Design a binder for this molecule. Structure first.
Ligand SMILES: Nc1ncnc2c1ncn2[C@@H]1O[C@H](COP(=O)(O)OP(=O)(O)OP(=O)(O)O)[C@@H](O)[C@H]1O
Ligand SMILES: [Mg+2]
Lengths: 71, 54, 71, 384, 50, 101
């Protein structure tokens, strides 16, 4: 019982990534409606990946988590 | 000006013109941006068949 | 005590949700099927900022889309 | 003013206590005598290192018991037989040895946060004559609650069993809540105080277990006063419908009869109940011989309202402006919490001035606001 | 020693018999449990302004 | 509400238009606007009822400048943002749109 080695922040996973190994079975060519939510999901997800700095150089905070809710 | 006077389904047309002008100036960045605006505005139900075709 | 393990796990979500923030990454996406299971320290902003609603009513062009993509 | 000397006298003795105690410890404590030194040799022989707390499930009478530990293995323990074999009972916490388990010893007291709620953490410094007035309805709580404990002498003379219990009721702001805290300050008997709105939980069956605890502590502590503050808050208060509700309310009421007297035959507990809704209580509790004399409170009359206002104005700064005697006159059979609110608000009007003189003008402005909670929280205003 | 030891102070123990070794610099504060799990910043009067 | 236990009762007014302008101004110093955008002008288009409503004009405006992809928040964003929140303001003043499904 002593700290004798370390383990990287990659290893000792809960489960590996599914976004660069596997790929989901859905795209927005097989989404139909919810066009109203389609404008909202690219604000939250798609724009911070390509450049998170967009929010910062505007001076608006980037949203935190996304709740999806409904029946 | 017609955002102070917004009640208009006639700005849907103005967006589509705006897209065509930008396209022929050969910028697709803001041709896409206006075209996106025009799609959103026609999602609300008042639009002619002609308007949807354009 | 076993129901207190559940609560302890929720507390770690808050800790890691706070720690994650202002980083390039997309702040956690989570979805619910009942919006009566939330708490006022989970739904509170800094954990969940954005609220994308999901209706069942939509409108006639967006219900039209659902008939057509599965068609 | 000029109590400085009394403060210094008191202080001086505190200094003398600090001194004597420190110096005594240091090479005159108990370091150099053989009835400590040789006794502890063989005390530590059978003691650890770990002293491994157990929970006493049951005793067996052969010098053994079955403990279940917090660490989950049982032990059929012995008992060394110097800690007094039968002085330990179920629910006690036991010191087991680091090797083969013997009851090394027994801990009396193990502070639970559940008896913290009942037990006091503050002293109720307002006692007799800061609730002054109702001097005819304090002879039914200091001739049957305070006084038998202070003098069992008077009650040896008549013989029979001493008074048991009281129920206080009347209109809000007659000092009901503080009276109880003021007789328990002076006797210094074991003051448990439990609120009426904590008996009702949104969990079921553990409500009556909480109430059952309160009286076991009372019976364990020979001089005992239990203030149940608010037991009108059992018939107007409910949470969910599956663990609060009617079933919970019935159970708790019945638990309390067994506790208070029932069949238990426990130590002398005085019960003090604040209520003002006296049909939330059993027809087995508002019979007397458990609660003997019953106390009614009415709103204090005008000369009693002079006494109430005199507690409050010893703290108030005074002026040649101030006219106390007209502040009583407007009030007619009103509560002693209106008078207490007027003077606190009169000091709020002083503070706004940013002056430290409280005048007649500050009291009368605050009097009209205090009667406004009775004419405009009433939206009819003048009786329609 | 016991006058340098006090309630709500985390200790280190050495498992030779659980022999109290040193004080632990970090100890728990129960108030931080409340405030952290809630999560609540402080403000000045500029965020009430108006 | 028994008197003796409450000695201060503090109301909060749904804002003035003088107050509603200063709430816009507190949030707009986080933002980077195009110079010459008055926020007194925005507060008069609004009628609001909370300092959250004007917090949402600022928020929505910077999400419109996000879509646009300029650093500066434009005067156009604050026309549209007022009207989005105003529509949402008037749509819980009828009987209340749901916030949880
Ligand atoms: N005779 C009195 N002299 C001094 N202060 C009094 C007197 N009667 C009542 N008060 C004050 O009135 C206030 C309310 O009375 P208290 O809390 O003691 O019990 P109550 O009659 O149950 O009323 P409530 O619970 O509605 O306040 C307290 O601040 C108390 O000090
Ligand atoms: Mg009271």
């Amino acid at each position: 019982n002593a700290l004798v080695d370390i383990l990287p922040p990659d290893s000792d996973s809960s489960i590996s990534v599914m976004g660069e190994n596997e790929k989901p079975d859905v795209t927005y060519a097989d989404v139909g409606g919810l066009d109203m939510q389609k404008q909202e999901i690219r604000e939250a997800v798609e724009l911070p990946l390509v450049q998170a700095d967009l929010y910062e150089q505007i001076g608006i905070d980037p949203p935190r988590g996304v709740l999806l809710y409904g029946p | 000006e017609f955002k102070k006077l917004d009640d208009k389904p006639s700005l849907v047309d103005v967006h589509l013109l705006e897209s065509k002008v930008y396209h022929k100036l050969r910028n697709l960045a803001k041709s896409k941006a206006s075209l996106t605006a025009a799609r959103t505005a026609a999602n609300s139900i008042y639009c002619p068949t002609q308007t949807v075709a354009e | 005590g076993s129901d207190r393990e559940v609560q302890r796990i929720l507390i770690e979500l808050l800790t890691q949700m706070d720690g994650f923030d202002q980083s390039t990454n997309v702040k956690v996406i989570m979805a619910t099927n009942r919006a009566d299971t939330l708490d006022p320290a989970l739904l509170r902003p800094g954990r969940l900022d954005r609220k994308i609603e999901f209706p069942s009513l939509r409108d006639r062009r967006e219900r039209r889309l659902i008939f057509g993509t599965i068609a | 003013r000029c109590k400085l000397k009394l403060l210094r006298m008191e202080r001086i003795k505190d200094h003398l206590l600090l001194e004597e105690e420190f110096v005594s410890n240091s090479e005159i404590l108990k370091p150099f005598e053989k009835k400590q030194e040789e006794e502890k040799k063989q005390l530590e022989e059978i003691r650890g290192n770990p002293l491994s707390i157990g929970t006493l499930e049951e005793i067996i009478d052969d010098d053994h018991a079955i403990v279940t530990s917090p660490t989950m293995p049982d032990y059929y323990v012995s008992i060394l037989s110097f800690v007094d074999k039968e002085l330990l009972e179920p629910g006690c916490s036991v010191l087991l040895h680091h090797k083969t388990m013997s009851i090394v010893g027994v801990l009396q007291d193990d502070a639970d946060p559940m008896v913290s709620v009942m037990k006091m953490d503050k002293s109720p410094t307002e006692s007799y004559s800061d609730i002054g007035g109702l001097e005819s309805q304090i002879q039914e709580i200091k001739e049957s609650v305070e006084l038998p404990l202070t003098h069992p002498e008077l009650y040896e003379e008549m013989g029979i069993k001493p008074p048991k219990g009281v129920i206080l009721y009347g209109a809000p702001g007659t000092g009901k809540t503080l009276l109880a805290k003021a007789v328990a300050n002076q006797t210094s008997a074991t003051f448990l105080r439990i609120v009426g709105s904590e008996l009702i939980q949104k969990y079921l069956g553990d409500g009556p277990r909480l109430c059952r605890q309160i009286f076991k502590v009372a019976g364990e502590n020979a001089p005992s006063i239990v203030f149940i503050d608010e037991i009108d808050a059992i018939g107007t208060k409910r949470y969910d419908s599956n663990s609060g509700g009617e079933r919970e309310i019935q159970r708790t009421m019945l638990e309390l009869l067994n506790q208070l007297d029932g069949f238990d035959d426990r130590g002398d507990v005085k019960v003090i109940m604040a209520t003002n809704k006296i049909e939330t209580l059993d027809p087995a509790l508002i019979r007397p011989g458990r609660i003997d004399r019953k106390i009614l409170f009415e709103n204090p009359d005008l000369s009693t309202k002079k006494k109430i206002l005199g507690i409050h104005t010893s703290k108030m700064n005074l002026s040649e402006d101030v006219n106390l005697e007209t502040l009583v006159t407007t009030k007619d059979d009103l509560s002693g919490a209106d008078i207490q609110a007027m003077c606190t608000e009169a000091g709020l009007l002083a503070l706004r001035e940013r002056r430290m003189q409280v005048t007649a003008e500050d009291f009368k402005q605050a009097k009209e606001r205090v009667m406004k909670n009775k004419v405009e929280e009433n939206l009819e205003g003048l009786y329609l | 020693n016991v006058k340098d030891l006090k309630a709500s102070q985390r200790v280190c123990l050495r498992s030779d018999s659980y022999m109290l070794h040193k004080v632990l610099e970090n100890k728990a504060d129960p108030l931080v449990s409340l405030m952290m799990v809630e999560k609540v910043p402080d403000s000045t009067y500029d965020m009430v302004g108006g | 509400l028994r008197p003796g236990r409450i000695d201060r009762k503090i109301e909060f007014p749904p804002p003035s238009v003088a107050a509603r302008a200063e709430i816009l101004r507190i949030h707009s110093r986080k933002m980077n606007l195009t110079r010459g955008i008055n926020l007194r002008k925005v507060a008069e288009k609004m009628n609001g009822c909370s300092g959250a409503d004007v917090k949402g004009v600022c928020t929505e405006a910077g999400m419109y400048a996000l879509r646009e992809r300029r650093i500066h928040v434009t005067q156009e964003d604050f026309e549209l943002a007022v009207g989005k929140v105003m529509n949402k303001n008037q749509e819980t003043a009828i009987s209340v749109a749901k916030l949880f499904k």
